[PDB]
Amino acid sequence: SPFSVKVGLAQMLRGGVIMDVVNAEQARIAEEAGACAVMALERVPADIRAQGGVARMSDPQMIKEIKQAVTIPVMAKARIGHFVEAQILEAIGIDYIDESEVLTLADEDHHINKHNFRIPFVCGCRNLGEALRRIREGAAMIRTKGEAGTGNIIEAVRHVRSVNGDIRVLRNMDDDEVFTFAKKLAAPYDLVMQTKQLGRLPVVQFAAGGVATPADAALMMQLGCDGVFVGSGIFPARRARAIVQAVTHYSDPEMLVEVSCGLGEA
Amino acid sequence: KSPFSVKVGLAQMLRGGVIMDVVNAEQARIAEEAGACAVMALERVPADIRAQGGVARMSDPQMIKEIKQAVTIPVMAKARIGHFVEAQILEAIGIDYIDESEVLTLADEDHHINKHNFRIPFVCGCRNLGEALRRIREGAAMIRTKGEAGTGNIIEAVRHVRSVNGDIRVLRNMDDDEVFTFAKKLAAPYDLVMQTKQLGRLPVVQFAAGGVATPADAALMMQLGCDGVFVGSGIFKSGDPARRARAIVQAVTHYSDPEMLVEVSCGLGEAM
Amino acid sequence: SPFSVKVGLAQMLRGGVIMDVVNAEQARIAEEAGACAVMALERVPADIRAQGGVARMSDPQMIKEIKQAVTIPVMAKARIGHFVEAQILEAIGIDYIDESEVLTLADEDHHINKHNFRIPFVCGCRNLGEALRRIREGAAMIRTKGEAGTGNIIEAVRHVRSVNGDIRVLRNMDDDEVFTFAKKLAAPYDLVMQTKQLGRLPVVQFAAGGVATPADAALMMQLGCDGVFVGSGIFKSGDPARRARAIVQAVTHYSDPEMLVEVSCGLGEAMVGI
Amino acid sequence: PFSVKVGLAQMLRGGVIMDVVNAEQARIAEEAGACAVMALERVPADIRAQGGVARMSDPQMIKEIKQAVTIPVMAKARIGHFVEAQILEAIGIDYIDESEVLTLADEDHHINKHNFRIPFVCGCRNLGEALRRIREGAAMIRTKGEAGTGNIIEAVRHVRSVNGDIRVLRNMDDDEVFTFAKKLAAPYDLVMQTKQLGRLPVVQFAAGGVATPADAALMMQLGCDGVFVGSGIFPARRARAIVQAVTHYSDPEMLVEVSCGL
Amino acid sequence: PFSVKVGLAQMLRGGVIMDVVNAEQARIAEEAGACAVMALERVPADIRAQGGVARMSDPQMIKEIKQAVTIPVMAKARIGHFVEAQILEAIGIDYIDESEVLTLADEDHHINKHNFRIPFVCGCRNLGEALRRIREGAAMIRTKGEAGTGNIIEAVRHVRSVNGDIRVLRNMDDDEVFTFAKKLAAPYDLVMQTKQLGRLPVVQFAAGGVATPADAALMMQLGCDGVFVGSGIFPARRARAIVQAVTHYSDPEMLVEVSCGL
Ligand SMILES: */C=C\C(=O)[C@H](C*)N[C@H](O)[C@H](O)COP(=O)(O)O
Ligand SMILES: */C=C\C(=O)[C@H](C*)N[C@H](O)[C@H](O)COP(=O)(O)O
Ligand SMILES: */C=C\C(=O)[C@H](C*)N[C@H](O)[C@H](O)COP(=O)(O)O
Ligand SMILES: */C=C\C(=O)[C@H](C*)N[C@H](O)[C@H](O)COP(=O)(O)O
Ligand SMILES: */C=C\C(=O)[C@H](C*)N[C@H](O)[C@H](O)COP(=O)(O)O
Ligand SMILES: O=P(O)(O)OC[C@H]1O[C@@H](O)[C@H](O)[C@@H]1O
Ligand SMILES: O=P(O)(O)OC[C@H]1O[C@@H](O)[C@H](O)[C@@H]1O
Ligand SMILES: O=P(O)(O)OC[C@H]1O[C@@H](O)[C@H](O)[C@@H]1O
Ligand SMILES: O=P(O)(O)OC[C@H]1O[C@@H](O)[C@H](O)[C@@H]1O
Ligand SMILES: O=P(O)(O)OC[C@H]1O[C@@H](O)[C@H](O)[C@@H]1O
C-alpha cells in the first residue's frame, strides 16, 4: 500500500537526528556532523517565538538551495491545514513535509489530508489520541512535542511519557475495554488495535522541542523515541556532532561524558 | 463474505417490519398473527419497568423458550448493557437476536458487550450517530434509534431519528478533508463514518423504538426514514392489543397511504 | 511468616461461593448447596439497608449455633475499626472475620489492626489503593464491593474492572513510574511492586454486592474474580435452596454457557432489588 | 435591477481585487492583471497600526485612481453610512464596498443597498450574515478573515463555515429548512434560493490575510470565486504572482514558479 | 547496597556543604573546613536573578573542581533527568543532588536512584516528600528553604514540619500509623522505620537561605545533621565562620566570636 511505503521511508531515519537549517552552510554542517536529515526553514523556533509575526512556508528558492547543498533527505514545514503550501513543497522535490505547530496555524479545525500526497508527512502530537488522528490523516511519522524554542525538555518528557505510557496501558488492556478507550482517545479504533498489537506507535516517533544538550537527546532515546529533532539547540558544528553521537550511543555513559565535556554554552 | 456482514444481512430481512414486546406464548401468537416480523421476549414491558422500579434483568430462559416454541417468526430477547454472560446464556438458548437494551438496568456503565464474540446478531440502541457507529463497531448488526420507552410519547424518538438521519445527510456532501474532524467530534471510528458517507444511510438496519403509540406514530417513523419500528407498551397496555397490533403493522407496511392510515385508526380504541 | 500462612489458608476458597446466613437451617442449606463457607449474621444487607438502625456484630450465641451446624468454614462480620468485636469473634472460634462496610462504621478514620489477630480477615475494597491498604493492615482476603442489598451488579462490575484494570496497567508500567503510582494510590510501595510482579492481587479476591443471578456470579468469575459472596440474592428470592445450588454451579462452570442455561432455567423469582 | 447588479459582479469571477493608494499603484495593479482596484487612503494594516477614525476617502483621490485605469474601481464606505455611499456613487465608480475595516458608522443597521444604482460588496463571517447582506442588496460578498494581519486562519475558518453550511443546506430535509432559516436569522426565501443553487446567490470572494500566492490558491481550492488583497502586495511581481495563483490555482508547478524567490 | 550509601552519607554529619564555581572556590571551601563541595556553574541566587533554563554543569568544570580538593564533590542534576545522573556518575563524583533549583526535567517522576552506584541527595519540604525520595533511593535528604533569597523562614518552617511529624509519629498509636502513612502518601514500611528510629532514616541537612552563622547554628539546634550553603558565602572568613557555627552550635560565645565584624 502507498501508506505502508511512506511509513517504510520514515523508518530509515530511526536512530537519527534531524536538524533545522537556514542556509546551505548550516545544511553542510548538519550533514558533516551526521544528521539523518535537515529541516529547511527561514527562521528557527527560538526566533519565531521571540519575533512574533506570521510564520509560513519558506521560499522555494531557499529550500532548493538546501536540497542541492546536501545528500541526506530534506524536510520543510507547512502550516497546519495549509494543503496548498504542501502542494508547493511536494512540487519542489523535497523528501518530507512537516505539518508543523511552530508555524502559524492556517486551519484551526482541520489538518492537511495527507493521503492526497505522494511524499511522506511528519506531524506533531502531545498524546496518543492526537498521534493516531494524525496517522489516520496520513502522517508517516510523528513528532512528540515539547516546547519548541525554550531549550526546556520538561514538556517533551511529559508528552513522550504520556504517549508511551498509553501504549503500555493498551498492551494488556481487556479487549472488551478497547472500544471505550478509543472513544476516550477520540482515535480510530483500528489504529488503536494496531498499536495494541504492535506494542508501539505504528509509525516512527521522534521527540521534538527543547532538546538542548547531549543528555537531553540521550534521555529521549532512553524513554523510547526513535530519534530527535533539534532546531535552536545547535546553531555549533561541534554541538551538532555531540547530539548525533548522544543519539547513536544513548546507553553509553562514557560516550555521553566525552561528547558533553567542554561542549560550551547551550 | 464476512461473519459481521452475514449478521447484518440477517437483520436486513426485518426491513419494513414491526417488532413487538411479548410476555407469554399467547401474546406471542397475537403478535405473529397480526403480522409482526419478530417478537421481543421479556418479563416486564418498558411501561411496567418504568413505573414499578426494581432491577430489570434478562428473562428466565424457560419463559423465552416457551415464546420461541409458540411462533415461527424470529424471537429476540434483552440483555443488560455490558452483561456479556446474560448474552452468552441467551445465545445458548438458541434465539435469533440479542437486544443489548437500555430499558433493563445497566450492568456496566463504561463498556458494552463485545458483540463480535457472538455468532448471533445483536440489536443496540442509540440517540445520535456517534453512539450508533460505536455500537456497530462493537458488533451490533442492527440499531434502535431510541425515544422515551414506556411513555407513549413520540417526541424523543422524533428528536433522535432526526438527529441520526440529519447527521448522515450532513456527511453526504461533506468535504472529504473535514471528515477526520467530524469523526473525532462524533467519537466514532473514521472507517465507519466514511462507510456511512458512501452509503448515504446507516451501515445497518435502523428501527425506531420508544413511545410509538398509534398507527400515525408508526407511519411517522417510517416517513422520517426508519426501516421498521419496535413497539412494546403501545399495544398490550392499550384497550384492544390484537386490533392495535394489526393496525400498527399495517401502518408500517402502508406508511405513505393516508387512506390506509385512516382505516386502521378509525375506531381503534384507547391508546396506552 | 504468620501473615503468609493466613493468605495461604484462604486459597482454599478459590472457586467458591460464600453465603450470608441467619440461622442454622439456612447454614445447612448453604452447605448442602455446595457453599465453600457461610457468613453468619443477624440481618442480611438488603434488610440492613431497608430497616435502618445500628448494625453490629451478631450475638455470639447465634454464631455458635451456625458454627456447630456446618462443617465448612464460618465467617462473621465486625464493624470497621471495632477491634473488640473482632477479639470476641476470635474467642468464639470462627474461621474468618469480615471487617465489613455493611455494618455501621465504628471508626471512620482507622481500620482494625488485623496483624494483632491469629485468625484471617476479609476486608472490602472499591479500588486497588483501598485493597492494598487493607492488605497492609493485615487482611488475608479482599472483597471487591458493589452495592450491598440492591441486587444490582453495576457497582461490582465497576469496582472489579477498576481493581483489575489498575493491576493490568501496573504490570506493564515503566519501573521508574511505580513510585508515583504508589503515591497516587496512597498505597504501600512494597505491595504495589508485589502486585506488579504477580500480575494479580497478592491475596484471594472475591466479588461481593449485588450478585442476584447465576449470570451475575459467572460474570464476576469471567471478569477475573476468585469467587463471590452472596447475601440477599439467595434467601430474599423465591426458591433459595435451588437458587443457592444454581449460583454455586455457575461459579464452578462459569465458562460453560450450556450449564449456565441449565441452572438458570425455571429458577423462579430473583430478589426484588432496588 | 438586482439581478443586473448580481450579473455584473459575476464578471469578477476568477479575479484579484487589489487595494491601491494612488494612480501609480492602480496602474501596477492593472498591469499585473487585477480584475479591479479598491481605492483608499489607508491600507488595512496601516488602519490597524495608526488607529483613529477611518472613513470614505477624499473624492479627489478616488477620481484620480478612476482616471488612471480602465478596470473597475471600487471604494469603501463606512457601514451604515448611506451618505458616503451617495457621494461615491455620484463620483461614478463601479462598486461600493460597505466595509468593516472602516470605523463602523451605524452599529445596528447596514446601508439599504437597494436604493443605489451601482453594485455593493459586503462582508460576512457566516452564511446568515451573507444572506442578510444580500437581502439588503449586496451584489457581492466578501467572506472575511482578519484584515491587515497577513494571517489566513480566520479567512479559512469563515470560508469553511459559509461553504460547509451551504453543503449542509443542499441536502437538508425541506421540512427542516424553516428552522434552519430561523437559526441563521436569515430570510427563508434566500435560504431556499441558496439550497436550490447549491452555492451562494452572489459572487463570493475571500478577503483578509491573503499574503502569499499559496494563500490565494488555497482560497480558490476552498471554493471562493476570487480574492481581495490589500496589505499583502505594496511589488509588481508579488501582484502578478497572486493573479497567477488565482488563475492557475490547481497547478502546483505554476504555484512554485510564481512563489520562487518572491 | 542502599544501607552502604546511607552509611557513607552519615560521614557528612556535622558538616557544611558549600556550593562552588571553580577550583579556587573549592579550595577555599575545603580550607575553611567544609565537609564537601557542590560544584555548579550558577549559584542559586544567580539562577533566580538571571532566569533561563538551568541544567547539569559542564563535565569539564566538574572534573576540575574534583581534581582540586580531596573532600567529596557533589554535583546537581535536574529532577527526573536520569541521563544527567548517568553522566555525573561516569565523571566519578561522590554524590548526585537531584535538585529543585535546576529547571525541572520531569514534573511527575524523580530519578529511580536505586539504579545508581553513588549516593544521591534529594530535597523535601515535609516528611511525606522525604520518605518518598528515600524510597526512590536517596541516601540523604535536604530539608529545603527558599534557595537564593538569604531568608531562613521557609527552612525553619520545613525543618519544624519534618521533625514535628517525626515526633508525632514516635508515640502515635500503632493502629493509627496505617492511616498516617496514607495521609502522608508515604510507604508504610518507611513510616514504621522512621517511627522506630525516632528520626529520619537518612542524614537530614538544611538548605536554602542559610546566610549567617546564627542561621546555621539555628538549623543545628532545630535538629538538622548539617547545612548546605550556596549564595551565602561567595569570603574565606564567612565560610570558616559558618563551619565553626555548625561545629559549635550550642556555644553562644563561639557564635559571637565568628559573627563579630563579619
Ligand atoms: C514542535 C516542534 C516543531 O513543530 C518543529 C517543526 N520542529 C523543529 O524543527 C525543531 O526541531 C524543534 O524545536 P527546538 O528549537 O529544537 O526546540
Ligand atoms: C428504547 C427501547 C428499548 O431499549 C427496548 C429494548 N425496546 C422495547 O422492546 C420497546 O419496543 C420500546 O418501548 P415502548 O414501550 O414501545 O415505549
Ligand atoms: C459489601 C459487602 C459486605 O460488606 C458484606 C459483608 N458481604 C455480604 O455478606 C454479602 O455477601 C453481599 O451483599 P449482597 O446482599 O449479596 O448484595
Ligand atoms: C475585511 C476586509 C475589508 O473590509 C476590506 C474592504 N478588504 C480590503 O480591501 C483588503 O482586500 C483585505 O485586507 P488585507 O490587507 O488583505 O488583510
Ligand atoms: C534547595 C536547595 C537546592 O536544591 C540546592 C541544590 N542547594 C544549594 O546547593 C544551596 O546550598 C542552597 O541555596 P542557598 O543559596 O544557600 O539559598
Ligand atoms: O485535536 P486535534 O484536532 O486532533 O489536533 C489538535 C492540534 O491541531 C492543531 O490545531 C494544534 O496543533 C492542536 O494542538
Ligand atoms: O457513550 P457510549 O459509551 O457510546 O454509550 C453511552 C450509552 O451506553 C449506556 O451506558 C447508556 O445507554 C448510554 O446512553
Ligand atoms: O483506605 P481508606 O481510605 O482509609 O478506607 C476507606 C474505606 O474505609 C471506610 O471508612 C469506608 O468503608 C471507606 O470506603
Ligand atoms: O447581520 P448583522 O448581525 O446585523 O451584522 C453583523 C456585522 O455588522 C457590522 O456591525 C459588523 O461588521 C458586524 O460583524
Ligand atoms: O513527592 P512528590 O510530590 O512526587 O514530589 C514533589 C516535588 O517534586 C518535584 O517535582 C518538585 O520539587 C516538587 O516539590
Curated annotation (Swiss-Prot), chain A:
Catalysed reactions listed for this entry: aldehydo-D-ribose 5-phosphate + D-glyceraldehyde 3-phosphate + L-glutamine = pyridoxal 5'-phosphate + L-glutamate + phosphate + 3 H2O + H(+)
Binding residue positions for D-glyceraldehyde 3-phosphate: R161
Pathway field: Cofactor biosynthesis; pyridoxal 5'-phosphate biosynthesis
Record GO biological process: amino acid metabolic process; chlorophyll metabolic process; hyperosmotic salinity response; pyridoxal phosphate biosynthetic process; response to lipid hydroperoxide; response to non-ionic osmotic stress; response to oxidative stress; response to salt stress
Disulfide-linked positions: none
UniProt entry keywords in alphabetical sequence: Acetylation, Cell membrane, Cytoplasm, Lyase, Membrane, Pyridoxal phosphate, Schiff base
CC annotations in GO: cytosol; endomembrane system; plasma membrane
Keyword set includes 4Fe-4S: no
Residue positions of the active site: K77
Principal EC category: lyase
Cellular compartments annotated: Cytoplasm; Cell membrane; Membrane
Xref: SUPFAM superfamilies: Ribulose-phoshate binding barrel
Any one Gene Ontology molecular-function term assigned to this protein's record: protein heterodimerization activity
Record InterPro entries: Aldolase_TIM, PdxS/SNZ, PdxS/SNZ_N, RibuloseP-bd_barrel
Tissue specificity note: Expressed in cotyledons, rapidly dividing root stele tissues, stems, leaves, flowers, mature pollen, and siliques.
Knockout-associated phenotype: Plants have a lower leaf carotenoid and chlorophyll a and b content, and are impaired both in root cell division and in root cell elongation. Mutant rsr4-1 can be complemented by the addition of any of the vitamin B6 vitamers, except pyridoxal 5'-phosphate.
CDD domains: pdxS
Cited function: Catalyzes the formation of pyridoxal 5'-phosphate from ribose 5-phosphate (RBP), glyceraldehyde 3-phosphate (G3P) and ammonia. The ammonia is provided by PDX2. Can also use ribulose 5-phosphate and dihydroxyacetone phosphate as substrates, resulting from enzyme-catalyzed isomerization of RBP and G3P, respectively. Also plays an indirect role in resistance to singlet oxygen-generating photosensitizers.
Quaternary context: Homodimer or heterodimer with PDX1.1 or PDX1.2. Interacts with PDX2.
Anything else known: Vitamin B6 is an essential quencher of singlet oxygen in plants, that can protect cellular membranes from lipid peroxidation.
Designated name of the protein: Pyridoxal 5'-phosphate synthase subunit PDX1.3
Organism from which the protein derives: Arabidopsis thaliana
Gene expressing this chain: PDX13
